[PDB]
Amino acid sequence: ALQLAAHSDARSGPVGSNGGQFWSFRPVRPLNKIVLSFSGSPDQTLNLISITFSSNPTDIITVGGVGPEPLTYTETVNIDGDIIEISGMIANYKGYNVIRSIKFTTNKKEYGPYGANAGTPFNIKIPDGNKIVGFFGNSGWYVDAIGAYYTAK
Amino acid sequence: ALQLAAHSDARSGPVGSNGGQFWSFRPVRPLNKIVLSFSGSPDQTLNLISITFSSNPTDIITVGGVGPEPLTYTETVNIDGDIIEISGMIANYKGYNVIRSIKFTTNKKEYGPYGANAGTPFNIKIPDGNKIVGFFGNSGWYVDAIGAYYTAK
Amino acid sequence: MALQLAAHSDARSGPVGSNGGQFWSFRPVRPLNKIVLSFSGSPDQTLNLISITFSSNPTDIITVGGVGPEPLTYTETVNIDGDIIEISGMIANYKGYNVIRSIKFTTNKKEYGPYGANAGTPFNIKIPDGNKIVGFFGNSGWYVDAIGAYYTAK
Amino acid sequence: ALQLAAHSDARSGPVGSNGGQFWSFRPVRPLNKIVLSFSGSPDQTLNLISITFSSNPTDIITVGGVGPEPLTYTETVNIDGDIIEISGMIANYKGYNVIRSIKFTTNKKEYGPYGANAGTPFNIKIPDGNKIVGFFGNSGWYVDAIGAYYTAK
């Protein structure tokens, strides 16, 4: 049978730092929901612990949060349209450089920033006419690194 | 700590044919369940239409199965230990070369092959001492191509 | 502290073929303009693809396959004009291994090949419309076991 | 007709910043010669503009240096061993964040850092028992980002 070469989407990143596990999530249908969980609080500071990406109840991934630290705040966001860019801050949290804040931008609106403001900035940008269709990265107790899969609209 | 570059696991594959969408699923925790959905019937010929990979608990992906055709049979595979090899057959279906049967092999037990085991064979093997920790590929109405992410135990 | 502006990696198509001892990858900054195919055996009979040499002016070059003792007896020099859009060929058994045996390169206008032993299992590397192939990767040892391409929009 | 899945090596990185062109160089034999091309002068400021990686014999690639700025100094690094880590500094040059200095480290020797050793540090390390067998990144007039391919020794 003819081996008709199968394709893999281009990538941007990862940014952030090395973690114990590589992770990757590129669903067939567009991402429409993101759930972010933190420890701490606004009064002090929100420590990003995990992020959950979903396309529906049958397509979900959770990165970070494998540690014992109790979560104190979670927020569920509905993503309208295609993500086109993300940015955020990276900084040390209990001995590890991790993603500390994140902001998503689609062709419809902005979401965030969610997390702590301080540290080194990062941002994922793609060429004109493209959309982000998945994410990948490294994680452990926290979200250490993140990058995106993108393709032409 | 140090600003260490993040890593991406090695890949094996993909095998099969190009498809409309690229898909990827590499969860932090070990893949422990796989649900294969087909059309047709066991006493006749099973037609793989979609596959669902999951990791305990809230990590799941469903690839293929975007078309109309109703599901008439499903095979639930509960994985024990680390998958180290997968194999199966590729053959034409309603005008498309797609994965038609698949088998998963761990360190001590085998699961399958499930589906219509006839056509062009394939198998994903990895270096010894490694384990498969995720899968990626192409899909549309069906599962067009498949490959694996692996890393050392 | 410097902004971490995520760097990109081109999309891929493939690889097709079979697993091999070494992974190889060659994606030069400039266009891929010359490809040299090296074979063993006499061409008035049957040529066995042993290695491929990809290059890009002025001096970017890579040679994959050909690590073994088989001598090269014939070479084919393909001077690519334009952007490569697709490649194809055949995979067959050679001395116990499933390897790339023939290969054809296709740009927008003309096409080069196929060269080698055009017999066995066909493969085809096609990219989306408006894109071009800008590099190759694969597995190889004594022979060229597998190959794939990197592509990006024109 | 057996489709025995072909593999692709694990990756570390890339680090730095997005660039106009993606580049990749992973030769069959190990790397043994690296040429760093700079602008300016050793006594003043050394500006890394391009890098030439080489694996004897004939396997060579040059990334960065596509710009008009003339080279005025080069550092030839002959490595006789397996590279296990690289590191360096990133900092601005003509309005762009680029790789400014770089150091290569094998199982038993260090080479560098060569270039303007100032700015934001980067470290690409790999799991123990592995070796870097290739490099990839983005570049234009300069070397914007770099990452490595690695595999078990």
Residue numbers in the entry:
A (entry chain D), B (entry chain C), D (entry chain A): 2 to 154
C (entry chain B): 1 to 154
Please quote the authors directly.
The apo IPO showed an orthorhombic space group of I222. A reasonable volume of the unit cell (Vm) for the Matthew coefficient was estimated at 2.19 Å3/Da and 44% solvent content by 8 IPO molecules. However, only 5 IPO molecules in an asymmetric unit could be built after molecular replacement. We obtained a higher Matthew coefficient with 3.51 Å3/Da and 65% solvent content. In the packing diagram for apo IPO, we observed a tetrameric association with an additional monomer in an asymmetric unit. The additional monomer could form a tetrameric association with the other 3 neighboring molecules, which were generated by symmetric operations (-X, Y, -Z), (X, -Y, -Z), and (-X-1, -Y, Z). So 4 IPO molecules could form a tetramer.
